[PDB]
Amino acid sequence: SPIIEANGTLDELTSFIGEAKHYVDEEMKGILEEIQNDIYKIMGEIGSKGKIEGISEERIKWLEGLISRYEEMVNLKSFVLPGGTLESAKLDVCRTIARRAERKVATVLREFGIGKEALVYLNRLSDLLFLLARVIEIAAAAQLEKELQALEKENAQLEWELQALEKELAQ
Protein backbone atom coordinates (compact mmCIF):
# COMPACT_ATOMS: atom_id res chain seq x y z
CA SER A 1 0.00 0.00 0.00
CA PRO A 2 2.33 2.76 -1.23
CA ILE A 3 -0.42 5.34 -0.72
CA ILE A 4 -1.32 4.26 2.82
CA GLU A 5 2.33 3.82 3.81
CA ALA A 6 3.35 7.15 2.25
CA ASN A 7 0.55 9.15 3.90
CA GLY A 8 1.07 7.35 7.23
CA THR A 9 4.72 8.37 7.35
CA LEU A 10 3.88 11.95 6.37
CA ASP A 11 1.57 12.04 9.38
CA GLU A 12 4.46 10.84 11.54
CA LEU A 13 6.71 13.54 10.06
CA THR A 14 4.38 16.45 10.85
CA SER A 15 3.82 14.97 14.33
CA PHE A 16 7.56 15.00 14.98
CA ILE A 17 7.72 18.65 13.93
CA GLY A 18 4.97 19.38 16.45
CA GLU A 19 7.21 18.02 19.22
CA ALA A 20 10.51 19.63 18.24
CA LYS A 21 8.91 23.08 17.94
CA HIS A 22 8.57 23.32 21.74
CA TYR A 23 12.37 23.11 22.11
CA VAL A 24 13.36 25.95 19.75
CA ASP A 25 13.15 29.73 19.72
CA GLU A 26 10.31 31.84 18.33
CA GLU A 27 11.99 32.16 14.92
CA MET A 28 12.56 28.43 14.55
CA LYS A 29 9.08 27.68 15.91
CA GLY A 30 7.45 29.95 13.34
CA ILE A 31 9.28 28.24 10.49
CA LEU A 32 8.38 24.78 11.80
CA GLU A 33 4.72 25.71 12.09
CA GLU A 34 4.69 26.92 8.49
CA ILE A 35 6.30 23.66 7.38
CA GLN A 36 3.78 21.71 9.43
CA ASN A 37 1.10 23.68 7.59
CA ASP A 38 2.78 22.74 4.31
CA ILE A 39 2.90 19.05 5.23
CA TYR A 40 -0.85 19.26 5.84
CA LYS A 41 -1.34 20.57 2.28
CA ILE A 42 0.97 17.90 0.80
CA MET A 43 -1.07 15.15 2.44
CA GLY A 44 -4.20 16.58 0.83
CA GLU A 45 -2.86 16.25 -2.73
CA ILE A 46 -1.43 12.75 -2.20
CA GLY A 47 -4.51 11.55 -0.30
CA SER A 48 -6.88 12.68 -3.08
CA LYS A 49 -4.87 11.12 -5.97
CA GLY A 50 -4.67 14.54 -7.62
CA LYS A 51 -8.28 15.58 -6.97
CA ILE A 52 -7.04 18.23 -4.51
CA GLU A 53 -4.55 20.92 -5.52
CA GLY A 54 -1.20 20.46 -3.81
CA ILE A 55 1.44 22.86 -2.60
CA SER A 56 2.63 25.83 -4.59
CA GLU A 57 6.13 26.20 -5.97
CA GLU A 58 6.59 29.23 -3.71
CA ARG A 59 6.67 26.90 -0.72
CA ILE A 60 9.67 25.16 -2.29
CA LYS A 61 11.45 28.44 -3.03
CA TRP A 62 10.71 29.49 0.54
CA LEU A 63 12.66 26.51 1.86
CA GLU A 64 15.50 27.14 -0.59
CA GLY A 65 15.76 30.72 0.65
CA LEU A 66 16.02 29.61 4.27
CA ILE A 67 18.49 26.87 3.34
CA SER A 68 20.76 29.43 1.68
CA ARG A 69 20.58 31.72 4.72
CA TYR A 70 21.57 29.06 7.24
CA GLU A 71 23.95 27.38 4.78
CA GLU A 72 26.03 30.57 4.90
CA MET A 73 26.64 30.16 8.63
CA VAL A 74 27.90 26.57 8.54
CA ASN A 75 31.44 26.07 7.19
CA LEU A 76 32.14 22.47 8.23
CA LYS A 77 29.21 20.21 7.35
CA SER A 78 30.82 16.87 6.36
CA PHE A 79 31.80 15.37 9.79
CA VAL A 80 29.34 16.19 12.59
CA LEU A 81 27.69 13.73 14.85
CA PRO A 82 23.90 13.93 15.32
CA GLY A 83 22.42 15.36 18.51
CA GLY A 84 25.07 17.73 19.86
CA THR A 85 22.39 19.09 22.21
CA LEU A 86 18.95 17.98 23.35
CA GLU A 87 17.35 20.61 21.11
CA SER A 88 19.39 19.67 18.05
CA ALA A 89 18.64 15.98 18.68
CA LYS A 90 14.92 16.63 18.12
CA LEU A 91 15.61 18.08 14.66
CA ASP A 92 17.93 15.24 13.63
CA VAL A 93 15.17 12.71 14.38
CA CYS A 94 12.70 14.58 12.15
CA ARG A 95 15.21 14.59 9.27
CA THR A 96 15.39 10.78 9.20
CA ILE A 97 11.59 10.43 9.42
CA ALA A 98 11.37 12.82 6.53
CA ARG A 99 13.77 10.63 4.56
CA ARG A 100 11.55 7.51 4.55
CA ALA A 101 8.56 9.69 3.79
CA GLU A 102 10.48 11.25 0.92
CA ARG A 103 11.09 7.76 -0.50
CA LYS A 104 7.45 6.72 0.02
CA VAL A 105 6.23 9.89 -1.70
CA ALA A 106 8.62 9.27 -4.61
CA THR A 107 6.75 6.01 -5.16
CA VAL A 108 3.41 7.84 -5.27
CA LEU A 109 4.69 10.23 -7.94
CA ARG A 110 6.13 7.25 -9.84
CA GLU A 111 2.78 5.44 -9.96
CA PHE A 112 0.26 8.32 -9.82
CA GLY A 113 2.08 11.30 -11.38
CA ILE A 114 1.09 13.57 -8.47
CA GLY A 115 3.31 15.09 -5.84
CA LYS A 116 5.97 16.49 -8.15
CA GLU A 117 6.33 19.61 -6.03
CA ALA A 118 5.72 17.67 -2.81
CA LEU A 119 8.59 15.31 -3.68
CA VAL A 120 11.04 18.16 -4.30
CA TYR A 121 9.76 19.96 -1.21
CA LEU A 122 10.50 16.96 1.03
CA ASN A 123 13.97 16.60 -0.48
CA ARG A 124 14.88 20.16 0.43
CA LEU A 125 13.10 19.89 3.80
CA SER A 126 15.48 17.23 5.13
CA ASP A 127 18.47 19.35 4.07
CA LEU A 128 17.20 22.36 6.02
CA LEU A 129 16.43 20.37 9.18
CA PHE A 130 20.05 19.20 9.19
CA LEU A 131 21.37 22.78 9.05
CA LEU A 132 19.01 23.87 11.82
CA ALA A 133 20.46 21.25 14.15
CA ARG A 134 23.97 22.46 13.30
CA VAL A 135 22.91 26.10 13.72
CA ILE A 136 21.39 25.26 17.14
CA GLU A 137 24.74 23.60 17.92
CA ILE A 138 26.42 26.91 16.85
CA ALA A 139 23.84 29.06 18.73
CA ALA A 140 24.01 26.93 21.93
CA ALA A 141 27.80 26.41 21.65
CA ALA A 142 29.17 29.67 20.24
CA GLN A 143 27.31 31.67 22.88
CA LEU A 144 28.64 29.12 25.36
CA GLU A 145 32.10 29.73 23.88
CA LYS A 146 31.63 33.35 24.94
CA GLU A 147 30.80 32.39 28.52
CA LEU A 148 33.83 30.07 28.43
CA GLN A 149 36.28 32.88 27.66
CA ALA A 150 34.53 35.20 30.12
CA LEU A 151 35.13 33.04 33.20
CA GLU A 152 38.62 32.19 31.89
CA LYS A 153 39.53 35.90 31.73
CA GLU A 154 37.89 36.79 35.06
CA ASN A 155 39.80 33.98 36.80
CA ALA A 156 43.15 35.13 35.41
CA GLN A 157 42.43 38.72 36.47
CA LEU A 158 41.53 37.60 39.99
CA GLU A 159 44.80 35.67 40.22
CA TRP A 160 46.85 38.77 39.44
CA GLU A 161 44.80 40.97 41.76
CA LEU A 162 45.41 38.56 44.64
CA GLN A 163 49.16 38.09 44.06
CA ALA A 164 49.50 41.86 44.21
CA LEU A 165 47.61 42.41 47.47
CA GLU A 166 49.40 39.63 49.40
CA LYS A 167 52.93 40.87 48.86
CA GLU A 168 51.62 44.43 49.11
CA LEU A 169 50.57 43.77 52.76
CA ALA A 170 53.84 42.41 54.20
CA GLN A 171 55.82 45.37 52.73
Partner: protein, 146 residues
Amino acid sequence: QLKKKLQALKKKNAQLKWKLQALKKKLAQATQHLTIAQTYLAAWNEEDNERRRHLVGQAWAENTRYVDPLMQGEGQQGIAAMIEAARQKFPGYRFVLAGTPDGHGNFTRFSWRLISPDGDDVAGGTDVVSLNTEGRIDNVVGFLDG
Protein backbone atom coordinates in the same frame (compact mmCIF):
# COMPACT_ATOMS: atom_id res chain seq x y z
CA GLN B 1 33.68 17.69 29.01
CA LEU B 2 32.01 20.77 27.54
CA LYS B 3 29.43 21.21 30.31
CA LYS B 4 31.97 20.09 32.93
CA LYS B 5 34.50 22.69 31.83
CA LEU B 6 32.10 25.62 32.10
CA GLN B 7 30.77 24.44 35.46
CA ALA B 8 34.33 23.66 36.63
CA LEU B 9 35.41 27.28 36.15
CA LYS B 10 32.28 28.75 37.74
CA LYS B 11 33.07 26.79 40.92
CA LYS B 12 36.69 27.99 40.75
CA ASN B 13 35.60 31.60 40.18
CA ALA B 14 33.33 31.46 43.24
CA GLN B 15 36.26 30.42 45.45
CA LEU B 16 38.73 32.96 44.01
CA LYS B 17 36.20 35.80 44.37
CA TRP B 18 35.39 35.10 48.03
CA LYS B 19 39.11 34.93 48.76
CA LEU B 20 39.42 38.38 47.21
CA GLN B 21 36.56 39.35 49.53
CA ALA B 22 38.48 38.06 52.55
CA LEU B 23 41.82 39.32 51.26
CA LYS B 24 40.79 42.95 50.64
CA LYS B 25 39.27 42.88 54.13
CA LYS B 26 42.78 42.11 55.40
CA LEU B 27 44.16 45.21 53.65
CA ALA B 28 41.87 47.70 55.39
CA GLN B 29 42.97 46.04 58.65
CA ALA B 30 46.73 46.62 58.52
CA THR B 31 46.20 50.14 57.18
CA GLN B 32 43.79 50.93 60.04
CA HIS B 33 46.50 49.98 62.54
CA LEU B 34 49.05 52.13 60.72
CA THR B 35 46.78 55.20 60.71
CA ILE B 36 46.19 54.89 64.46
CA ALA B 37 49.92 54.44 65.07
CA GLN B 38 50.76 57.49 62.96
CA THR B 39 48.10 59.64 64.62
CA TYR B 40 49.24 58.55 68.09
CA LEU B 41 52.93 58.99 67.30
CA ALA B 42 52.24 62.20 65.35
CA ALA B 43 50.91 63.68 68.58
CA TRP B 44 54.01 62.54 70.47
CA ASN B 45 56.39 63.73 67.74
CA GLU B 46 54.68 67.09 67.15
CA GLU B 47 57.08 69.86 68.10
CA ASP B 48 54.40 72.56 68.46
CA ASN B 49 52.29 72.07 71.57
CA GLU B 50 49.37 74.22 70.36
CA ARG B 51 48.66 72.05 67.29
CA ARG B 52 48.75 69.05 69.67
CA ARG B 53 46.00 70.49 71.84
CA HIS B 54 43.94 71.14 68.71
CA LEU B 55 44.64 67.64 67.36
CA VAL B 56 43.74 65.85 70.59
CA GLY B 57 40.61 67.95 71.02
CA GLN B 58 39.48 66.92 67.54
CA ALA B 59 40.86 63.38 67.24
CA TRP B 60 40.61 62.24 70.86
CA ALA B 61 37.34 61.74 72.70
CA GLU B 62 36.37 63.71 75.78
CA ASN B 63 36.04 60.46 77.76
CA THR B 64 39.43 58.90 77.00
CA ARG B 65 41.91 57.16 79.30
CA TYR B 66 45.67 56.41 79.20
CA VAL B 67 47.86 54.32 81.50
CA ASP B 68 51.50 53.18 81.31
CA PRO B 69 54.02 51.89 83.92
CA LEU B 70 55.13 55.29 85.24
CA MET B 71 52.17 57.61 84.72
CA GLN B 72 48.49 57.73 83.85
CA GLY B 73 45.87 60.18 82.62
CA GLU B 74 42.35 60.38 81.26
CA GLY B 75 40.60 62.94 79.06
CA GLN B 76 41.92 65.34 76.44
CA GLN B 77 43.11 67.81 79.08
CA GLY B 78 44.96 65.23 81.17
CA ILE B 79 46.50 63.58 78.11
CA ALA B 80 47.40 66.97 76.61
CA ALA B 81 49.20 67.83 79.86
CA MET B 82 51.08 64.52 79.90
CA ILE B 83 52.08 65.04 76.27
CA GLU B 84 53.16 68.61 77.05
CA ALA B 85 55.26 67.43 79.99
CA ALA B 86 56.88 64.59 78.04
CA ARG B 87 57.90 66.80 75.11
CA GLN B 88 59.12 69.54 77.45
CA LYS B 89 61.35 67.04 79.24
CA PHE B 90 62.72 65.52 76.01
CA PRO B 91 62.94 68.37 73.48
CA GLY B 92 63.99 67.18 70.04
CA TYR B 93 63.39 63.51 70.80
CA ARG B 94 61.26 61.46 68.42
CA PHE B 95 59.10 58.33 68.33
CA VAL B 96 59.50 56.21 65.18
CA LEU B 97 57.26 53.30 64.22
CA ALA B 98 58.84 49.84 64.32
CA GLY B 99 57.58 46.78 62.50
CA THR B 100 54.08 46.55 61.11
CA PRO B 101 51.18 47.44 63.43
CA ASP B 102 48.48 44.79 63.65
CA GLY B 103 45.42 44.09 65.75
CA HIS B 104 41.77 43.04 65.83
CA GLY B 105 38.44 44.67 66.67
CA ASN B 106 38.98 48.07 68.28
CA PHE B 107 42.43 46.97 69.49
CA THR B 108 45.68 47.87 67.74
CA ARG B 109 49.12 46.64 68.73
CA PHE B 110 52.32 48.17 67.43
CA SER B 111 55.86 48.76 68.54
CA TRP B 112 58.04 51.82 68.27
CA ARG B 113 61.62 52.82 68.93
CA LEU B 114 62.71 55.91 70.83
CA ILE B 115 65.26 57.78 68.71
CA SER B 116 67.59 60.29 70.34
CA PRO B 117 67.97 63.77 68.78
CA ASP B 118 71.37 62.67 67.41
CA GLY B 119 69.83 59.51 65.89
CA ASP B 120 70.91 56.76 68.31
CA ASP B 121 68.50 53.88 69.04
CA VAL B 122 68.22 53.89 72.85
CA ALA B 123 65.00 51.89 73.51
CA GLY B 124 61.44 51.13 72.39
CA GLY B 125 57.88 50.48 73.47
CA THR B 126 54.53 48.97 72.51
CA ASP B 127 51.04 50.47 72.76
CA VAL B 128 47.43 49.26 72.54
CA VAL B 129 44.81 51.81 71.43
CA SER B 130 41.00 51.56 71.67
CA LEU B 131 38.42 53.64 69.75
CA ASN B 132 35.07 54.77 71.18
CA THR B 133 31.67 54.41 69.50
CA GLU B 134 32.16 57.87 67.96
CA GLY B 135 35.41 57.16 66.10
CA ARG B 136 37.44 59.00 68.76
CA ILE B 137 40.31 57.58 70.83
CA ASP B 138 38.99 56.45 74.23
CA ASN B 139 41.85 54.26 75.54
CA VAL B 140 45.61 53.87 75.10
CA VAL B 141 47.79 51.38 77.01
CA GLY B 142 51.56 51.52 76.65
CA PHE B 143 54.28 48.98 77.49
CA LEU B 144 58.07 48.86 77.79
CA ASP B 145 60.36 46.53 75.82
CA GLY B 146 63.95 45.44 76.36
